């Protein structure tokens, strides 16, 4: 699994 977020909430 990657270590970053694109869509937050």
């Amino acid at each position: 699994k990657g270590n970053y977020v694109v869509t937050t909430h």
Partner: antibody
Amino acid sequence: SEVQLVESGGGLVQPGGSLRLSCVTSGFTFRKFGMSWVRQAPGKGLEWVASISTPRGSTTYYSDSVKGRFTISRDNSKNTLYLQMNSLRAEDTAVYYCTRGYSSTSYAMDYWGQGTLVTVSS
Amino acid sequence: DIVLTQSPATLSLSPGERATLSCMTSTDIDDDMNWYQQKPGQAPRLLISEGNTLRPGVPARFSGSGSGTDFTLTISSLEPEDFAVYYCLQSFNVPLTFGQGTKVEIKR
């Protein structure tokens, strides 16, 4: 291309100086996409600079080369991405491209602007 | 940081021939590999995204294969417009990192 990314704010700057790049977008719902800056030094390859989350842009990522010196931000009401560039060095000289992350879960770029040239020199 | 190693740095071929471009990664990146084309003076163009997904509008002669650590871009039969530089990009982790490029040039 229906999607357009238009960079501005580039130019000459002295080492130690600052510039703020802007990218105004059209052709998509800006607030729904992650965005990045990628640069290309003269005669060299591509190098990722920074990325920002969607929608608010709370969450940001930087290359070690620029961490602490550059800040990525967005203003969704203006469809605009920014790169504040401080403490500039000669090796920051490059064409800077605004880019759109192609999916809701990846910063891999689909669309690119034409780029803006930043030249850092005394 | 994940290192992408593209080879050969120069691929010398004629129109009509099959082009095979390789990108190897320093660690397993699952299928998060992307391929770009760039011509002189122009911005890059995305050809293939994560999962070897051909982008809409990109000609069928382009295809990506491989996963894990060893990735290939194939151009089944080169058209004159395909002589250009190609970059690979991993989007598994930050920092997002690119290969150093492969130039597909005209053999004579």
